[PDB]
Write an enzyme that holds these catalytic residues in place. Structure first.
Site, PDB file in Angstrom:
ATOM      1  CB  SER B  49      16.702  39.676  42.645  1.00 22.73           C
ATOM      2  OG  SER B  49      16.941  40.715  41.714  1.00 22.73           O
ATOM      3  CB  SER B  97      14.344  42.983  42.493  1.00 20.44           C
ATOM      4  OG  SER B  97      14.027  41.804  43.211  1.00 20.44           O
ATOM      5  CB  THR B 188      11.230  37.172  42.620  1.00 18.40           C
ATOM      6  OG1 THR B 188      11.445  38.550  42.950  1.00 18.40           O
ATOM      7  CG2 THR B 188       9.783  36.803  42.907  1.00 18.40           C
ATOM      8  CG  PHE B 190      14.214  37.428  35.389  1.00 19.94           C
ATOM      9  CD1 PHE B 190      14.394  36.295  34.598  1.00 19.94           C
ATOM     10  CD2 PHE B 190      13.868  38.629  34.772  1.00 19.94           C
ATOM     11  CE1 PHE B 190      14.254  36.364  33.214  1.00 19.94           C
ATOM     12  CE2 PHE B 190      13.722  38.705  33.391  1.00 19.94           C
ATOM     13  CZ  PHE B 190      13.917  37.571  32.612  1.00 19.94           C
ATOM     14  NE  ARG B 232       9.537  36.044  39.240  1.00 19.97           N
ATOM     15  CZ  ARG B 232      10.341  37.100  39.196  1.00 19.97           C
ATOM     16  NH1 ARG B 232      11.661  36.944  39.237  1.00 19.97           N
ATOM     17  NH2 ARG B 232       9.824  38.319  39.114  1.00 19.97           N
TER      18      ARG B 232
END
EC number: 3.5.2.6
Lengths: 244, 247
Positions: B49, B97, B188, B190, B232
């Site tokens: 993302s 996201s 962020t 993932f 994170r």
């Protein structure tokens, strides 16, 4: 159209506060307020003038760009938190009066009047010293007018480059949540006398979901210990409305 | 950037949580970077993302995204997450996201234009193969921690091969934390859990404007379980707190 809303009155009574809150959903064409009269009553903008002044400074070249650093000349300033190099946002957030006085000076009286006429900003009265008209001068603006101005800023409709409007808009972010985003600015003309009190402001807008809410708050103030109220009342209202 | 140095004092934060990862922290004024792992700082991982940053920029430049007020309307079809099942702004789509939203952006940009802008951006290996709508999550695009900070700095200074106006729009959409003294723009990432032997990657990239100083950062970590995902943010947060940058 401005509509009176009586349910917000409790937040002013509990604190014994003479003030007004204007709140408009989506656009400024239909606003709600606790006081019809006061919603359009014009007060000294104080530090809320740092918004239009930041745009003007950018448009005129006085402020060179987004990343301009306002350097401290080592000379004493009225507040210790102003005694340092500042960014645009930095100067805006600590309300660095001398930074914006110098900007205003370099803009000059002619260009300042030109842009306040363009922005339809209050009584557009910049008389009584170029470096002090928004704090102790003759400039007056209402909560309804603050709202119309900020909506123009939001929609990039002010007589200024979209670039310069985006720059100021980012300089105005005060709260970032996953749900909502807050752009806001405080004002404080001083304490004044008990007969003629000063004015405290909190103006701005909130972007929640796919919705926008424009707001402006002002109140009478003769005691600086009542200052936090300028944020806590409008926040309490907006929290109970489901906005923040 | 100008220089990088290995600083093993940040390992305390990784060791505590049994995390294999890397933090890069660069100071804009001095052009100098610090990392706990020089080797991993240069290892290229799936952006996931975090690719939404350049993708949003490319989307705005090609006209696929109208302006900063464009609503990416939800039709009514079932999506992968409940948080994605609504109308979203540019910031919203970035914050939650939203995969389908940005897939749609990517497809309308197409491979030819995506390739062009990623070359202009110097964005990783520049490998957009593996489907135009999935090359960033499960395809062939790889970017390193050092590359990210370089990219984000270029964005910050409006030096990217796009209009300043569009770079401003994305920069505000990335604001995640605002305090009177500092401003946090962040994203962020993932890529999934992978397997036990081939772990997935989780990212937190962005920058902090604090005083007249700007701090660019890129964090990533090996992840095999979603329970370890909040790590994170917390590890780099704890690092920047101890550096006196945030909080």
């Amino acid at each position: 159209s401005i509509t009176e809303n009586t349910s917000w009155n409790k937040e002013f009574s509990a604190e014994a506060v003479n003030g007004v809150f204007v709140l408009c959903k989506s656009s400024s064409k239909s606003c709600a307020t606790n006081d019809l009269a006061r919603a359009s009553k014009e007060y000294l903008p104080a530090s809320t003038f740092k918004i239009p002044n930041a745009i003007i400074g950018l448009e005129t070249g006085v402020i060179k760009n987004e990343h301009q650093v306002f350097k401290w000349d080592g000379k004493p300033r009225a507040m210790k938190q102003w005694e340092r190099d500042l960014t645009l946002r930095g100067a805006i957030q600590v309300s660095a009066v001398p930074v914006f006085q110098q900007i205003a000076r370099e803009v000059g009286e002619v260009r300042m009047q030109k842009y306040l006429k363009k922005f339809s900003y209050g009584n557009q009265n910049i008389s009584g010293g170029i470096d002090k008209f928004a704090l102790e001068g003759q400039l007056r603006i209402s909560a309804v007018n603050q709202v119309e101005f900020l909506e123009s800023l939001y929609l990039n409709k002010l007589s200024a480059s979209k670039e310069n409007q985006l720059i100021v808009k980012e300089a105005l972010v005060t709260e970032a949540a996953p749900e909502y985003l807050v752009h806001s600015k405080t004002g404080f003309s001083g304490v004044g006398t008990e007969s003629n009190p000063g004015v405290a402001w909190w103006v701005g807008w909130v972007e929640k979901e796919t919705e926008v809410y424009f707001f402006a708050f002002n109140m009478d103030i003769d005691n600086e210990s009542k200052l936090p109220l300028r944020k806590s009342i409008p926040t309490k209202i907006m929290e109970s409305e489901g906005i923040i």
